[PDB]
Structure 1
Amino acid sequence: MGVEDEPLLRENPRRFVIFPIEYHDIWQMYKKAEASFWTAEQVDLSKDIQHWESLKPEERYFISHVLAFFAASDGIVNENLVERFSQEVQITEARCFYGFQIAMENIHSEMYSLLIDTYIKDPKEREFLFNAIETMPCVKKKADWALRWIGDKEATYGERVVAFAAVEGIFFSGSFASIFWLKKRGLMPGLTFSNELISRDEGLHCDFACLMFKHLVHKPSEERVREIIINAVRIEQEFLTEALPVKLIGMNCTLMKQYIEFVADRLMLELGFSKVFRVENPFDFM
């Protein structure tokens, strides 16, 4: 207590023995992840350049910045997995999932950097984008938020898994929606296809967070989860309307705000709680 009372977190002397499977729900999530393995090299980028050059300058600006934000945020997610989640969780089934998630984050990061390298030849612009955590004010709020949760020496796994579900599910939702908006406009097949793989993968990662949360005996209160989630929505809404505005690609900022709230509601429910915002999904393409 609290930890020796937690089956996910307590001493498992069989942690590195794989069989037999005890947690079938957790294990099938791992098999799902494993069965959808893909590499950056599988994405065909050979038709993207022509589409990229035809875009308006501010569209290229928005897209390059979303790419830089994704590439940077993956490393933070990865950091948390490597230093915290994969270490503290003791059941084999989740250890397998988290090990495969780490591998997939590296692939996601590579994919985003390949996209950057393909669209942007200027080495100074590349470096600017690769070092977005330092060079880009817009990503700072999100990046710092996620990083606080890694160094938080007091917050429970229950709270931290919620926080990273908000990272992978809320902090990414506006940017995913943006790339899907571009698909509606028939632009950049490489970008839009890779976007389908990564958002699927990220959805699975949030699904897994909720599954872990469910197996906790001592969950944080609804009030506590509410304040993490709302806080995250606010940061995301600001990111998308002020810091890096979605009108740069022709999107309605007001509907985007509503969508972030739809997303957070779906996550709240998946976590076994009640909706916070009670709004519908404005986007038919999501």
Structure 2
Amino acid sequence: FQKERHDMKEAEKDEILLMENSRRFVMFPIKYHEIWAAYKKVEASFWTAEEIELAKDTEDFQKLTDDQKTYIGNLLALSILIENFSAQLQNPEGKSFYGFQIMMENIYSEVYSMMVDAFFKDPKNIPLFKEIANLPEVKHKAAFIERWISNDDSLYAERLVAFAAKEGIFQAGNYASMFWLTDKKIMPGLAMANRNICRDRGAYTDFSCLLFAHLRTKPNPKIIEKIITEAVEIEKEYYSNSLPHTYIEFVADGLLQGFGNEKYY
């Protein structure tokens, strides 16, 4: 599928999505009902760090196993381009959704920090990985984004599928873990914060499945399965190399179906 990629490159011009929308001063007679309803949906779920209580939630932290404390450490330490995608999507509907997404990301970056603070004390001294941020596993994550998204020789539809991998596939391990550690009464806080981020991250991933869906020229079905797999490999990696399952494959398939493909696992 080399030659055909050349055609899609010339075809991306007929994509009304990537195309202009000029002359539309007033925006309410909505032209993109689908992405708009997607934006309204995340706009309604707007939440903040303040709406989260970690007090009397830190009790159940220091009671965890000596190493379970080390886990969460990196988990937070890790977590703690949307602009480019937003720049390519030419319409008020889409850019509104994107502006909201990066807006919410900063709140996640705050809530995460708060945990690092209320738990591992003010000093970031306890967080080990924080000093060696740029370590192997992440370099592999950075390479993936360097392959399908950053690489000049890439197509919009492709970058979309990769973006979703990076949004839904990747940190699936994280949430999968915390959903466990926050299963039944243990830490009500980290629980709500996790329930939310996972919900929004899901939506942010769907949004790319929604855009993709509206693309007139889809890329080859194999490249898709070729983009996901790689992220599933880069995921299993640190997900089972940082701290002490095959949940990724499950999600990896749902997303595969999300773009109109066959379940690889």
Question: So what's the TM-score if we normalise by structure 2?
Answer: 0.89
**Is 223-232 or 268-277 further displaced after alignment?**
268-277
Matched, 1:22 2:21: no
Identify unmatched segments of 5+ residues in structure 2: 1-9
Distance change >3 Å, CA 37–CA 19, structure 1 → 2: same
- Counterparts of residues 127-206 of structure 1 (less than 5 Å): 133-134=133-134, 136-146=135-145, 148-184=147-183, 186-206=185-205
SS of 1:93's equivalent in the other structure is helix
Structure exhibiting the larger radius of gyration computed from Cα positions: 2
- Counterpart position of 1:6: 15
The one-character-per-residue Cα deviations of 1:2-35 (angstroms, maximum 9, x if unpaired) are 3320111012214775322011111100000100
TM superposition shift of 1:185: 5.3
What is the distance in 1 between the residues matched to 2:73 and 2:21? 45
Percent identity between the aligned chains?
46
Equivalent residue pairs, number: 256
Instruction: Flag the structure with higher helix content.
Output: 1
- Counterparts of residues 1-286 of structure 1 (less than 5 Å): 1-14=10-23, 17-71=26-80, 80-82=81-83, 84-121=84-121, 123-125=123-125, 133-134=133-134, 136-146=135-145, 148-184=147-183, 186-241=185-240, 243-246=241-244, 256-257=245-246, 259-277=247-265
The 8 Å contact of residues 12 and 217 in structure 2, kept in 1 or not, is answered as no
TM superposition shift of 1:128: 5.4
TM superposition shift of 1:153: 1.8
Distance change >3 Å, CA 86–CA 139, structure 1 → 2: same
TM superposition shift of 1:146: 3.0
What is the distance in 2 between the residues matched to 1:14 and 1:109? 37
What is the distance in 2 between the residues matched to 1:45 and 1:129? 23
What is the distance in 2 between the residues matched to 1:54 and 1:240? 24
What is the distance in 1 between the residues matched to 2:162 and 2:131? 23
Amino acid at match of 2:36: W
TM superposition shift of 1:264: 0.7
SS of 1:53's equivalent in the other structure is coil
The one-character-per-residue Cα deviations of 1:138-173 (angstroms, maximum 9, x if unpaired) are 433224433555532221121111111111111111
Question: So what's the TM-score if we normalise by structure 1?
Answer: 0.83
SS of 1:49's equivalent in the other structure is coil
What is the distance in 1 between the residues matched to 2:57 and 2:147? 37
Runs of 4+ in 1 over 4 A off after TM superposition: 14-17, 126-132, 147-150
The one-character-per-residue Cα deviations of 1:186-209 (angstroms, maximum 9, x if unpaired) are 322111110001000001011111
What is the distance in 2 between the residues matched to 1:232 and 1:41? 33
Distance change >3 Å, CA 14–CA 67, structure 1 → 2: farther
